[PDB]
Amino acid sequence: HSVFEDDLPFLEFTGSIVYSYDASDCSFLSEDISMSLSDGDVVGFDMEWPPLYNRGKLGKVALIQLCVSESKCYLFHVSSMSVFPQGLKMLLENKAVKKAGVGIEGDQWKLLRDFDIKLKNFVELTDVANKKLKCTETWSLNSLVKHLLGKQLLKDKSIRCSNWSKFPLTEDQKLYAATDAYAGFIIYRNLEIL
Ligand SMILES: [Mn+2]
Ligand SMILES: [Mn+2]
16 A cells, blocks of 8 residues: 555644533533633534434434634533523524534534524535645545545544543544544644645
8 A cells, every 4th residue: 555545643642631511510611611702713623422413313412512712622412401591502502603624514404404403604624625635536524634644544443433422522533522522623724725
């Protein structure tokens, strides 16, 4: 196999991972996020859900990740919250904050479906790359991490495709879920060249 085929080092977030599994708590964290951002700021977005199917569809969303800086990532374990955090809902529906990721359009659908939350102001990284990188490629979060950071995403399937609704999350789940948002945040920020 070629050099381009080589196994690159793993992308692993090493900053602050804030784990929240209580509604009230979550709403206040969301306000913290909002106090630390300004209109037009982009955060890394992503979500996880259990593997078992529910009445014909994928398991209901259980976790939401938001990387707001190169050193802080939020893990909102909504599946463990009695009611969906009102502060998070306003954050995800606030077009003042932009959400970046790969396959977000799909996340929007599932989000509206599982929680009736309307995700506002999101960018499909695939398009941001093709635009700023002056190309016309088919991307995945992983292929973007590789091409731009010289790294690949953690891939233990037993982790990534694990029961995200199971409380509490394990350090590995937290790391995985957290790094995806981070990659979303870093990849967007790095594509701002001209
Ligand atoms: Mn995802
Ligand atoms: Mn993910």
